């Protein structure tokens, strides 16, 4: 059952204007719109983790920005909750080759949850009990050089997820440019989320590795911009510097 075979290392990196999503499902063109919501602040520091085949649990402060570039299909799903114990409720977003499953039950998580597959994926390594729950959900797979970005937040008992794909040449860190994120689902979970983790898949264990970035959202005010075809091509952070504040004031 529960085993400990993962160690993690941390490095620091800058963001360079990443984490912009569409604020609403309305078409606009050739306009400059001002929105106040939770965003990823420009030029912020993001921890870069390396998981090598112990790892603690990360906090969940008003949303999380998650990005990775691993093409080996080793990262799949996340855990969200407040104590990650069998005494409260917690989310279990899990992905596989054909569908995603989203459940929220009184799970009894292990210290180092992961998935083991042999020759047919198994699940016993994650928890022990799964009672007391009603909310299940299935849909198409979330995950298909390639950078994948996700944004999560919990407001008014609703869980929102955004995503985007971007073919990018290999680099030391995150690229420079703009690429807006589009919504996926707004679930009516209505639970308490304070801490979160990530899930890894191993073959039987055989050696493996993964790399991913983590960033936290904050309440800001942005000044987006739509081109003639309806795509967001630029943005301005109002609370970054006096020049940006002047641009926000003058619209």
């Amino acid at each position: 059952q529960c085993v400990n075979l993962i160690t993690r290392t941390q490095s620091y990196t800058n963001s360079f204007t990443r984490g912009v999503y569409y604020p609403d499902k309305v078409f606009r063109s050739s306009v400059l719109h001002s929105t106040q919501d939770l965003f990823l602040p420009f030029f912020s520091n993001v921890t870069w983790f390396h998981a090598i085949h112990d790892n603690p649990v990360l906090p969940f402060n008003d949303g999380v920005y998650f990005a990775s570039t691993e093409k080996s299909n080793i990262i799949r799903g996340w855990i969200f909750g407040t104590t990650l114990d069998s005494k409260t409720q917690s989310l279990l977003i899990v992905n596989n080759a054909t569908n995603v499953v989203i459940k929220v039950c009184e799970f009894q998580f292990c210290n180092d949850p992961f998935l083991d597959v042999y020759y047919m994926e198994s699940e016993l390594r994650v928890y022990s009990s799964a009672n007391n729950c009603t909310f299940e959900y299935v849909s198409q797979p979330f995950l298909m050089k390639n950078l994948r970005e996700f944004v999560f937040k919990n407001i008014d008992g609703y869980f929102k997820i955004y995503s985007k794909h971007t073919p990018v040449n290999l680099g030391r860190d995150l690229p420079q440019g703009f690429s807006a994120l589009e919504p996926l689902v707004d679930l009516p979970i209505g639970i308490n989320i304070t801490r979160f983790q990530t899930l890894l898949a191993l073959h039987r264990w055989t050696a493996g590795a993964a790399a991913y970035y983590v960033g936290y959202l904050q309440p800001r005010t942005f000044l987006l911009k739509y081109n003639e075809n309806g795509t967001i091509t630029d943005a301005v952070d109002c609370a970054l510097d006096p020049l940006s504040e002047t641009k926000c004031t003058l619209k």
Partner: protein, 299 residues
């Protein structure tokens, strides 16, 4: 005046009248299952209230009057008589049982036992609540103990959030490590409805309906026949509940799959997508302009 001097004067301007009317609603045939909600044998407790999602159905809101002995709704942001003619994304139904004096706390802004420890509503609630007495069934004899409620909690809840933990709450700086008294209490305390309490102390039944506006494609709304599409003619239309008057035209805007509306500088609808045939159309008002009269003096 009865006398007009020489000059040019400006009078009322001309508008082009509409010819016919257009209605366009999606392909929905099945009926919403409100009977299994209202006419239910068992009703959940206030701390573990139940939420049921309703989608892809035609909702006849006047049927609910033939389902339970209640007087009227108390609706915020909408009106009870116009539940038809509007299309929503989803409809929810939160249901539980509370005490009579505490019904008034099911509303935005209320504070107390409920709305702080049991069931919180947001400040922008759209929807309303159906409440009625249930003395005959929920108060069989010598009280009841199936219905529980949280008595106290370390912090207030948040809109629509749920707490289900059954722990021991401390009142003194020592750890309880189980129930011991004078510091430790069991937060789930139960009232018991004897069939002799006062009017305010009798049990009640509550059903809350919450609506969200049109951002996703519409799934739930009432019966309405739909006509054909008429274009290049001034006409008044109805697309999933929005009204207006103008000219419908072929469009070339590149709507993304999750978008269904367009907006102008003044935040007025410009483009629209037909619910049945997913094509893009434009809306422009039919022509108008000023009129002037040139005359010499009536003398």
């Amino acid at each position: 005046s009865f006398t007009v001097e020489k000059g040019i004067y400006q009078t009322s301007n001309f508008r082009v009248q509409p010819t016919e009317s257009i209605v366009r609603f999606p392909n929905i045939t099945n009926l919403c299952p409100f009977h299994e909600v209202f006419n239910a044998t068992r009703f959940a407790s206030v701390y573990a209230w139940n939420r049921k999602r309703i989608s892809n159905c035609v909702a006849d809101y006047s049927v609910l009057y033939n389902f339970a002995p209640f007087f009227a709704f108390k609706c915020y942001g909408v009106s009870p008589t116009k539940l038809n003619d509007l299309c929503f994304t989803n409809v929810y139904a939160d249901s539980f049982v509370i005490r009579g004096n505490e019904v008034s706390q099911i509303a935005p802004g209320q504070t107390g036992n409920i709305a702080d420890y049991n069931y919180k509503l947001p400040d922008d609630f759209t929807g309303c609540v159906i409440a009625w007495n249930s003395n005959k069934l929920d108060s069989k004899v010598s009280g009841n103990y199936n219905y529980l409620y949280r008595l106290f909690r370390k912090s207030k809840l948040k809109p629509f959030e749920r707490d289900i933990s059954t722990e021991i709450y401390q009142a003194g700086n020592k750890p309880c490590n189980g129930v011991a008294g004078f510091n430790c209490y069991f937060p789930l305390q139960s009232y018991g409805f004897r069939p002799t309490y006062g009017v305010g102390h009798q049990p009640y039944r509550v059903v809350v309906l919450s609506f969200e506006l049109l951002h996703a494609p519409a799934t739930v709304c009432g019966p309405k026949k739909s006509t054909n599409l008429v274009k290049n003619k001034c006409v008044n239309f109805n697309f999933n509940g929005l009204t207006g008057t103008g000219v419908l035209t072929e469009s070339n805007k590149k709507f993304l799959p999750f978008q269904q509306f367009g907006r102008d500088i003044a935040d007025t609808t410009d483009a629209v997508r037909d619910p049945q045939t997913l094509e893009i159309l434009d809306i422009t008002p039919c022509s108008f302009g000023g009129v002037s009269v040139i005359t010499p003096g009536t003398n």
